[PDB]
């Protein structure tokens, strides 16, 4: 009878199931690292700071841009100031 | 993204207490489970790309037969064709299964074939073909039989035209089947 | 004692073999005699020599008439082809009319003629008739001995000890259920303490809110003898601890059987006076086995008996421990062979027993009843007789040319129902009969044989299933191991129109695992009943009626282990503390490597975290649930 | 890391006993322990 | 996975020869075959 068209391709099944396996494990297993930057209360002050940077980028007063950006970097360099600056009240 | 999540928590506050979630568990958790099992399940596709149209029979179209006496012309080109090429009845399978009792391999390796795999080819022994001659071919066949002691080789070759429309690539399958003719043998003397 | 006590049931095995391996009407008489004596052997051994010898002489007279009637039908060795093709209701293959003597028609050389042909491989059959004749006369010597006069006197004391054996079962079961009662009460006291600890901390937070040859001869001595012998002795120690629960009560009943024989030596009974001095003069050894013995009311020969069986040496002491394990845990052994012959014979009539095993032998909460074991014994006897029939080439579906037609085809309805004319037609049904009757003999040795019609049985059946206070075990780790081994075997089954059936196996395996975590986390016994019922029915239909293959048999063996464990969690209830992960308990070295190896599998930690979120009843979102369990996995 | 296993096992048995206000308050302790590494230094000393 | 079974020789089976004078029939069909199809000796390589 006619067969008009394994061992070297089921290994590529195991390859793609491992790649998608650790791809889904990206979404898990490392979000305790991201708790301190996403599980935070009232975020009103930092939107005030970011919208300040945006309108300063419009009005070309770029010294204020650098000084507000130093406030952002230092807010993301010190999580206890993140706790101060993101209380609820 | 955080601010919009906090404002939907403000605008639609769930009760600050022991609130078990009702059906959003089945809404998105069951979505995740079914999606992830489907990621385990695509070897359905990996095994549906294997062994699909296996089963189309190689019932041949033509069967030819030659007989070449040495390096000279064949005596026959009997292209036995349809309708003289006849497939089997199931009683023909019964005939093979009854005629090949004392061998177990015969029974097994005939039972490997379907009720359509094995086809006859009723070859006519009466060729309508003038055997072409020449006084070199005339005399040197006579010399190779009467005077010639070198071994004359008699072939017996085949052909099989197969449906390329039924899949497959190899049309023709042939084998040569040589017997030699010894000097002072009975065969050369009768042919002479 | 091997000969004069245990080589009587071996005779009934040889009677069953002479019935089985040579097939005739007289072989059917051997089968019926074997079935009658396997039923009534425990009362045949307790008779007296004026009646048991009369029944035994009827059996010897039967075997002699089998031999002589085969001589009377060796008359038809000469007149053979005259009666062959003329239909005398095809009388040749009734009595297996074939000869063995050389100077005649030369059988199994005129086998070449086939139209209305004979059976040569079942010969005159006087071999097994003479072997049975040897065993029958040897037992007549045994029943006419004084050694059997000790053995039957030993058996009558067990016939008296049936009631106290059931009393010892009652004592151990009350002690075990109260032991689980103490465990549950202490555990809930711990949960009360810990919940008060949490509430006290957070009410403080409310108030704060308010504010030389020898170098390798050492190897070929130590690593040859001593280390291997230590491992063999460790296996003996493991089996002794495996069946101490049976060994202690058997030794207590052994001592009381000694004293009851010394009471039965001249009288029947006297107010159970042998029970008065037995447990009182030895009570520390009668404390682990017996509990309520003294509430209702020293032996030196057994002491030197134990002292001279303690020095048997290895590979006989190991065999003694193995036979004690077989004799103790024999419900599982009967279940093992009921599964095993159905794994081999893939028929539709061998489906009848393991369906009833998984749904009615495993689901009766204390023990299987009288009714199941009598049903299993009667159905195996019916199956032996009906497979003994249709070994005859009478009817045209049993003929040989159509057998060559329907060779290796699971569509022929006798092959579907289990009527194949193969030489090994009894696959494991002989082993199944000896297993069922041995377990009947153990339960007879103890005290164990005590819109409108379906309702008073089944409502009471579920009333047994949902009102007993029985136990508290968690077998889900072992159930899930069996499910992974099912997945491993199915993926090994792709290493082979058959692979499109292993795919539907994978979908149903994933569906069953999902419903298993659902029913496990929600503790629903009712749902687990319905789930096991639908799985036993649907898998036993879908495998055998639709789809032999060794990997399919091996997947079935792991799956039926899984049915045994799921029914063992139908009984013994659910504990009131599921307690999260099973590897986060011991904090060991190997426990750590099993936990990381668990997380190396691609899609288990995802599904464990998601399904534990869905089927528990918390207030967190999905991402909050993930944050907690990622914290807990890192910290473990 | 003894204290944080105490906190996580507290959350698990509170998930059993369905006293879910205690679950939310202990989970606020986890989030704040992972929002402030100096409290991580306090809470994970050796002693 | 590259250049594995490169090296099997294309020794032919049959060689035919025709001579067609215009649109008419050939004068020859000389299917020269084995054993009249003969491979080389190394001396034939020396001859070339």
Short mmCIF file of C-alpha atoms in Angstrom, two decimals, chain C residues 11-38 58-70 124-133 136 384-385 388:
data_model
loop_
_atom_site.label_atom_id
_atom_site.label_comp_id
_atom_site.label_asym_id
_atom_site.label_seq_id
_atom_site.Cartn_x
_atom_site.Cartn_y
_atom_site.Cartn_z
CA UNK C 11 -5.01 -33.43 46.58
CA UNK C 12 -8.00 -31.30 45.61
CA UNK C 13 -5.68 -29.21 43.43
CA UNK C 14 -4.58 -32.42 41.66
CA UNK C 15 -8.26 -33.41 41.28
CA UNK C 16 -8.87 -30.02 39.66
CA UNK C 17 -5.83 -30.43 37.38
CA UNK C 18 -6.98 -33.89 36.23
CA UNK C 19 -10.36 -32.36 35.50
CA UNK C 20 -8.86 -29.39 33.66
CA UNK C 21 -5.93 -30.53 31.53
CA UNK C 22 -7.76 -33.58 30.11
CA UNK C 23 -11.33 -32.78 29.13
CA UNK C 24 -14.19 -35.30 29.15
CA UNK C 25 -17.45 -36.00 30.97
CA UNK C 26 -15.43 -37.80 33.63
CA UNK C 27 -13.17 -34.76 33.86
CA UNK C 28 -16.32 -32.73 34.53
CA UNK C 29 -16.99 -35.18 37.34
CA UNK C 30 -13.51 -34.44 38.70
CA UNK C 31 -14.36 -30.73 38.60
CA UNK C 32 -17.65 -31.14 40.46
CA UNK C 33 -15.98 -33.36 43.06
CA UNK C 34 -13.28 -30.72 43.51
CA UNK C 35 -15.89 -27.97 43.95
CA UNK C 36 -17.89 -30.01 46.48
CA UNK C 37 -14.80 -30.84 48.53
CA UNK C 38 -13.48 -27.27 48.42
CA UNK C 58 -17.07 -42.90 46.90
CA UNK C 59 -14.38 -40.62 45.47
CA UNK C 60 -11.88 -43.48 45.03
CA UNK C 61 -14.60 -45.62 43.41
CA UNK C 62 -15.28 -42.75 41.02
CA UNK C 63 -11.64 -42.60 39.89
CA UNK C 64 -11.49 -46.37 39.36
CA UNK C 65 -14.65 -46.20 37.25
CA UNK C 66 -13.07 -43.36 35.23
CA UNK C 67 -10.11 -45.61 34.40
CA UNK C 68 -12.25 -48.65 33.63
CA UNK C 69 -14.77 -46.71 31.54
CA UNK C 70 -11.83 -45.37 29.57
CA UNK C 124 -6.63 -41.23 26.94
CA UNK C 125 -5.76 -39.26 30.06
CA UNK C 126 -4.95 -42.18 32.34
CA UNK C 127 -1.82 -40.31 33.50
CA UNK C 128 -3.62 -37.78 35.68
CA UNK C 129 -6.21 -40.39 36.66
CA UNK C 130 -3.41 -42.57 38.03
CA UNK C 131 -1.77 -39.56 39.71
CA UNK C 132 -5.07 -38.71 41.42
CA UNK C 133 -5.41 -42.40 42.31
CA UNK C 136 -6.56 -40.61 46.99
CA UNK C 384 -14.69 -22.79 35.25
CA UNK C 385 -17.57 -25.07 34.20
CA UNK C 388 -14.74 -26.30 30.47
#
